[PDB]
Design a binder for this molecule. Structure first.
Ligand SMILES: [Fe+2]
Length: 54
């Protein structure tokens, strides 16, 4: 799974860690995160994130 970054603030979503305090368990691919989740650092929608190509 690839990491995704919030293109508004720079936060990085790492699938190995998830975002558990907001219901995203470690091991969740970004596309499977429920679509109403927002960036935990600035609050913008998932549509402002982009795949980080390794
Ligand atoms: Fe953000």
């Amino acid at each position: 799974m690839k990491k995704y970054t919030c293109t508004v603030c720079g936060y990085i979503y790492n699938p190995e860690d998830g975002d558990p305090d907001n219901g995203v368990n470690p091991g969740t691919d970004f596309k499977d995160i429920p679509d109403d989740w927002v960036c935990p650092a600035c609050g913008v929608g998932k549509d402002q994130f982009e795949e980080v190509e390794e």
